Design a binder for this molecule. Sequence first.
Ligand SMILES: *C(=O)[C@H](Cc1cnc[nH]1)NC[C@H]1C[C@@H]2CCCC[C@H]2CN1C(=O)CCNc1ccccc1
Length: 306
Amino acid sequence: SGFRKMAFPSGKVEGCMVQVTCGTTTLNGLWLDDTVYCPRHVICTAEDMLNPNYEDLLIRKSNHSFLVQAGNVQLRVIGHSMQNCLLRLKVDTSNPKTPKYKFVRIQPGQTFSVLACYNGSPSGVYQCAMRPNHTIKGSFLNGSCGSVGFNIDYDCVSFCYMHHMELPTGVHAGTDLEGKFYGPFVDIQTAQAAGTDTTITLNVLAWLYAAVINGDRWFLNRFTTTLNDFNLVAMKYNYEPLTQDHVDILGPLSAQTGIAVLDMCAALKELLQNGMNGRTILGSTILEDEFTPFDVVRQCSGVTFQ
Ligand SMILES: *C(=O)[C@H](Cc1cnc[nH]1)NC[C@H]1C[C@@H]2CCCC[C@H]2CN1C(=O)CCNc1ccccc1
């Protein structure tokens, strides 16, 4: 029993973290096989950043402009290229700890684990959702760029995020591992802000199912809703609209618990209208939205408590 934000074991990723230095800028990169990935802004100084031209900054560097350290082993760069907002550095050694992996561009509302690193050195790990506004509520200090986000499925690490920057509100922005920002952001010091965010409706409902799997039913009711009248209600309360595909996704949890997805939607609808009456769900005073349907199935028992 219990229900906690839980990240994936970090070992496989830890053995991929290196330090990348260009001039007096230092950050993290990811070493898989004979390449190292890192934020391209490592070639910038504080002067450059606000209006940099990466192409023009980069042609001005050589391979030995880049210093790559793996523990205390110096790795020699023998090639480099830019790919969107990411540099790929080719090194003279293939990482012996490379795990099976792929890269994935994750969708808003999905979750990943983050290995926070400084100076190539893993310091901590937490779990984050991709917000609808394409931010993540991370925990990151200066030097944390190049830290990655990932999921693990069997033996295989699906890398899906690398950190670049922090926004005025204190949330974080970055790219997938082909260098393409999540959201409308750029790696320039520009007057860019988090857009308005929304609550992830699919995850809230998933987490309500979690509560029922672990034995709690207090927030249910006798009513049902149309998908459409749920959405009139959802919008008022700044929840994402529920679609039929989100309904389909909850089938397996609907089936484990015997609560119809639209009956659970009427439950949520009532919760939004009335509050939680000083009560808690899975230990929270508030509705939670950073657990996905998959996260619930992964962590909860396959046998419901009653
Ligand atoms: C990652 O290493 C950090 C980002 C970070 C810090 N805390 C959470 N996340 N690098 C930030 C760099 C690069 C970004 C590139 C996009 C535009 C803004 C730019 C800001 N960065 C800075 O380092 C600015 C910090 N100011 C500063 C002043 C004086 C001395 C050091 C740093």
